[PDB]
Design a protein around this ligand. Structure first.
Ligand SMILES: Nc1ncnc2c1ncn2[C@@H]1O[C@H](C[C@@H](N)CC[C@H](N)C(=O)O)[C@@H](O)[C@H]1O
Ligand SMILES: Nc1ncnc2c1ncn2[C@@H]1O[C@H](C[C@@H](N)CC[C@H](N)C(=O)O)[C@@H](O)[C@H]1O
Lengths: 249, 249
DNA sequence: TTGTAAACTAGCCA
DNA sequence: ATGGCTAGTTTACA
DNA sequence: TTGTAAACTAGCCA
DNA sequence: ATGGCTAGTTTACA
């Protein structure tokens, strides 16, 4: 693996003390949602107050590892987002709530509620002096859309010439099983949304921590974009896929 | 004023006793977000624990008006949604977190966070037997998309033939000032999303309560779909606009 | 054009 | 306090 | 084709 | 403690 890519097949809650405090620039956290998925383990088989008690345990181990300029993105479901975000507001300050629109809805067969098509991403910061660089994540227009948005009043603006803010709603399809990026992990996140978080909230060459890296999407996003990565995954098969993914760029 | 459609220029919190308990099928609440808007009053000038205390007060008066099959939609901002939704889960059951993608982002000039393009709507129910009808709110395909979505496995299914679930993310654009639906209210909500709430969670002939009706968007929806309405608005100017919007049907 | 899986069925009845 | 019936659920990748 | 407003700037300094 | 000044922010209505 490259220099700052550290892939650890260890339980994060047992091996976090090994990680030095105030040593991480960004935490990309995609922990189990509490939704009953199979990760080769029972991490997602926890529910209710037991899941919320576990979430706080790992968070109180990860927050100290954050530099005074560090930030943190946390994925969760709406079923536990209000409580998770309420706790993290007493430990950090919330900069954004990012809604990942997965375009493809969750299946099941219900007709008594609207279908799940969104995950909740909480953007928190340690202090008001958090590192945020928008320019590498600006989305530039194409020729046609730039012509449709340009006015004499807007001419010369950075949103029109360089690119606009991704906003707090990111419409990106989930990865199909046959998608080129897809690997053998049940909850693989698109590289597009993870790379955006690293390029905007981790200073170039800084260290990013994925307490639960799964298949190493945050590692790939840190290999390219030149950022340092520390990742923990209990599953060995997942840790393997992670290496292969970082050993193919 | 049509029958069943009831408009009041009063404070909801003081006139709550006038509303019989367990008499309302659906509460469509668009309360002040706590963002500093000017409705001719200072109701949106409350903040922090002052706003959440007032939110929990009106919610404690509005909840016992829901009959056992009742439901409630409440708009808010991500800055207070975790706290608001955490309190309501202690009183009611959360069925859904609907994200309104307003398509058009909020303005200001920031480059230190992602821009706001979404409001949070909470779908809470009093009990597990809440009324919910999806057929009136199913979105039928057009000739081109149904051709792209149709497979022999899906042929005959309600979603492909009748229409799909609108999902928990609603991409409806905010109303431009020059839009023909736009009236002189600072935060008018599109009738498309209010009618969806009324058609899915209120039976025809049922009663809808809007404690902060504003320009009367819910009054217009209840009138056009055969639902009874009760609304409150401290601003007489907005109350007037609410009258014209209903009487123009 | 088409097969097919993707973080988030549920209400009855027994 | 608990299963197992049912009708039932979208999009976009290859 | 073009003007224009829409629930959610932010740090600095005289 | 307080404006004011700055560089700065998108779509889709008409
Ligand atoms: N204590 C733990 N330490 C490290 N990893 C864990 C722990 N508990 C669960 N995990 C793993 O955390 C992962 C959570 C996943 N949602 C990560 C997905 C990852 N972002 C991906 O794109 O593949 C699962 O694969 C679990 O096996
Ligand atoms: N105690 C109160 N009682 C009744 N109305 C109030 C109260 N406080 C604030 N309001 C009004 O509630 C409204 C909140 C608005 N978001 C309503 C918008 C409304 N949904 C519309 O589509 O026009 C404002 O117009 C307030 O003037």
């Amino acid at each position: 693996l490259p220099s700052g890519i550290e892939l650890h097949n260890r339980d994060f809650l047992t091996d976090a003390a090994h990680l030095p405090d105030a040593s991480i620039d960004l935490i990309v956290a995609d922990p189990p949602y509490g939704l009953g998925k199979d990760y080769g383990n029972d991490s997602d088989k926890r529910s209710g107050d037991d899941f919320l008690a576990w979430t706080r345990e790992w968070l109180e181990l990860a927050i100290p590892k954050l530099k005074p300029s560090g930030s943190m993105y946390i994925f969760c479901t709406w079923q536990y987002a209000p409580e998770i975000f309420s706790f993290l507001k007493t430990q950090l300050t919330m900069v954004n709530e990012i809604i990942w629109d997965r375009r493809v809805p969750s299946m099941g067969g219900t007709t008594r509620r609207f279908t799940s098509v969104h995950d909740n991403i909480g953007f928190f910061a340690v202090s008001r002096a958090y590192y945020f660089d928008l320019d590498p994540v600006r989305i530039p227009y194409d020729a046609d859309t730039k012509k449709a948005r340009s006015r004499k009043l807007f001419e010369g603006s950075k949103w029109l010439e360089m690119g606009y803010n991704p906003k707090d709603v990111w419409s990106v399809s989930r990865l199909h099983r046959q998608h080129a990026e897809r690997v053998d992990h049940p909850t693989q996140k698109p590289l597009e949304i993870i790379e955006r978080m690293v390029l905007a909230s981790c200073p170039p060459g800084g260290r990013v921590l994925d307490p639960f890296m799964g298949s190493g999407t945050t590692a790939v996003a840190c290999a390219r974009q030149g950022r340092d990565f520390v990742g923990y995954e209990i599953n060995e098969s997942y840790c393997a896929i992670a290496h292969e993914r970082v050993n193919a760029l």
